[PDB]
Design a protein around this nucleic acid. Structure first.
Ligand SMILES: [Mg+2]
Ligand SMILES: [Mg+2]
Ligand SMILES: [Mg+2]
Ligand SMILES: [Mg+2]
Ligand SMILES: [Mg+2]
Ligand SMILES: [Zn+2]
Lengths: 55, 50, 197, 101
RNA sequence: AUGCCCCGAAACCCCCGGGCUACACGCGCGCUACAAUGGGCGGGACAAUGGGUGCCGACCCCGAAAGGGGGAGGUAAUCCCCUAAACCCGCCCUCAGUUCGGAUCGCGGGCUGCAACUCGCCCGCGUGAAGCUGGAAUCCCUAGUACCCGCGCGUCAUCAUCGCGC
RNA sequence: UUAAUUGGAUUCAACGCCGGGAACCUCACCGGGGGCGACGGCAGGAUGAAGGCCAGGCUGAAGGUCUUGCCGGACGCGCCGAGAGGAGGUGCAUGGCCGCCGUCAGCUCGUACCGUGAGGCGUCCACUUAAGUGUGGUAACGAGCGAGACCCGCGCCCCCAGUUGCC
């Protein structure tokens, strides 16, 4: 089968189990209260997600 | 690519085709003649060919 | 709990908006809003060209609904387009207008003065543009144009002014455009008057 | 009786007081008692992150924050009012939940 | 995100085993000590921020300990994490490389995992290295601040001498 | 040192930094194995292409190949151009973001005057302020952004509220 040599594996833990919902990278991903984004994308989309910086 | 579809034992006046149908799917599709099992070729079957 | 509800239904809008930006790149997609009622939702898109967004008599919105319901949430959608609230006081439309004008072939100085004159005409207090790329050279540069009052730091220059950013791909490279417009009703704290007798 | 219990919760503070006073007035206009809006503790979600893409330069951080204001109302059940609080038409950034005891 | 130039049956896409954890050596930031302004054993006192439905586990019962078998209540000012440590009283030690210091190693019992040798973490008995206050030099701090003692989130299937808060 | 011990950062402003506490993945690194050319044309193709399997060898393990013969029903990297994809090169080709001079007190404009001109004056002097923050004199008279104002917490009092909080 030529569909058995370009197909991945279903991980369920470890850095390779989750990827950013908008960029697509593994690594530093935010998992607080559910949203799943980079540390880089959350910083330039937050003020539209509702957040604000008070201090 | 040649030509290979024959030897389905056959004469003039009557016919009794060599290999049986397939019990898995509908009739018409044949089986193997490997020599130890009727492998059924595609569906999987190892009745130790009769 | 309840926070997991609030910040799960705030992300869907982010994704829808960030996709429609690309998709309706032209016709100047202005922004949207989801109204969630029983038995289904209802989406609104303030385009700048109802014609292009609708399609050829309704042969695009079908694809928009199927795409917006198969890849996204929004189990029962109903789209309809509208016309912009104030296209000359919304920075994130002027940014794309100037970016388009640039990548069509105009020189980068005619575009900026066209835009600033139009904006300060339709009645803004102050505007500021800033272009920076590989224009006229092989070492990059940066230029600035502005007209009047415009606050830059503090709290008032975070909620009153309107700012937007865009890109403009070309044959050499990209070019960034960044606008910032002040609505005609500024009312900084310093503007104290005397209600007289 | 059976003392319905309604729980509003929203992120904009102003747009909550107006539905609160709607409920208060509706109750008042008809004949029914009520326990005024009892403020419950705010739940503020906080997210600390770095600031630079690369790793060079000093380390400076951000503090994003999201606050969620809650309330609680106790009221009796009269269909003249139990219905009157159905055409109330909450805004889109507010949550409401109704349940009796 | 992106222009130009190279790869283009490969420098693209998947799978198994190894490495980033190698060690004569120079350096940066820290943790534990060199004991009495203390070490051990038994009792007595008082917190705050935060988190939980792929998860937080009260209560009962097996085990010396790690842990194991059941299992209420919780989509939250309700149920749970959660009777903190430095502090005090009583007894042993009495200035010693010691009842200080616990590196380094042997054997046995467990948890997470599709997989613990290379290279995970935790428990019980045993062995007991350098270290007796630090040369020229150099760092941080102006008040509920410096110093001293513990706790919570993050990363996370397990593992905190770290970062950010109390 | 090694088959590989993947890279970036070197005074302040590189060294518990790249949220970098890596068993597989993360992974970019050494050993091995297998898949991938939308689209236009070429040898070929319903006398049957592309394309798929029970069992057995090779193999670390595998219909991945070969042995064995079964099936499927139209296309064709065996040939040419192109095209996906790229944690491959270049931060000295760019955008965005961020550190440092520095939360320092600076940076300019309109008109008028002084110089053939680059330029100057205002922005200088005197005292005062955390501050180009002020008060006086003056070929200058007025303005803009930064500073201050603005936003969030802490400490004291009063009114409205009383459940899941207190007694
Ligand atoms: Mg390393
Ligand atoms: Mg001891
Ligand atoms: Mg091991
Ligand atoms: Mg690896
Ligand atoms: Mg300077
Ligand atoms: Zn991302």
């Amino acid at each position: 089968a030529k569909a058995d040599y370009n197909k991945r594996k279903p991980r369920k833990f470890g850095k390779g189990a989750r990827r950013c919902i908008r960029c697509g990278q593994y690594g530093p991903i935010i998992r607080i209260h559910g949203l799943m984004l980079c540390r880089h994308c959350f910083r330039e989309v937050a003020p539209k997600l509702g957040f604000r910086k008070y201090e | 690519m040649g030509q290979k579809w024959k030897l389905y034992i056959v004469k003039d006046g009557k016919v009794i085709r060599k290999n049986k149908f397939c019990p898995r799917c509908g009739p018409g599709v044949f089986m193997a003649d490997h020599g130890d099992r009727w492998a059924c070729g595609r569906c999987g079957y190892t009745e130790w060919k009769k | 709990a309840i926070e997991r509800y609030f910040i799960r239904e705030a992300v869907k809008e982010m994704l829808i908006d960030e996709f429609l930006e690309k998709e309706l790149r032209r016709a100047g997609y202005g922004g949207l809003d989801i109204k969630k009622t029983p038995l289904g939702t209802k989406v609104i898109i303030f385009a700048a060209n109802p014609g292009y967004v609708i399609g050829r008599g309704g042969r695009r919105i079908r694809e928009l609904t199927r795409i917006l319901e198969r890849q996204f949430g929004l189990e029962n959608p109903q789209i309809d387009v509208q016309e912009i609230k104030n296209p000359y006081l919304n920075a994130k439309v002027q940014a794309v207008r100037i970016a388009q004008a640039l990548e069509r072939g105009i020189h980068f100085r005619r575009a900026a003065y066209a835009a600033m004159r139009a904006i300060m005409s339709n009645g803004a207090r102050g505007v500021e543009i800033r272009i920076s790329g590989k224009l006229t050279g092989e070492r990059a540069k940066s230029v600035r144009f502005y007209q009047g009052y415009l606050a830059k730091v503090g709290n008032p220059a975070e909620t009153l002014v309107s700012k937007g950013y865009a890109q403009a791909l070309l044959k050499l490279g990209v070019i960034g455009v960044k606008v910032a417009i002040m609505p005609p009703d500024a009312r900084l704290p310093d503007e104290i008057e005397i209600i007289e007798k | 009786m059976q003392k319905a219990r309604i729980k509003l919760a929203s992120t904009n503070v102003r747009s909550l007081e107006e539905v609160a006073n709607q409920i208060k007035q509706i109750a008042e206009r008809t004949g029914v008692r009520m326990s005024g809006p009892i403020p419950l503790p705010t739940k503020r979600i906080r997210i600390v992150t770095r600031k630079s893409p690369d790793g060079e330069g000093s380390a400076t951080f951000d503090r994003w924050e999201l606050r969620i204001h809650k309330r609680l109302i106790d009221i009796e059940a009269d269909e003249r009012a139990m219905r009157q609080i159905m055409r109330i038409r909450v805004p889109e950034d507010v949550t409401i939940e109704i349940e009796l005891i």
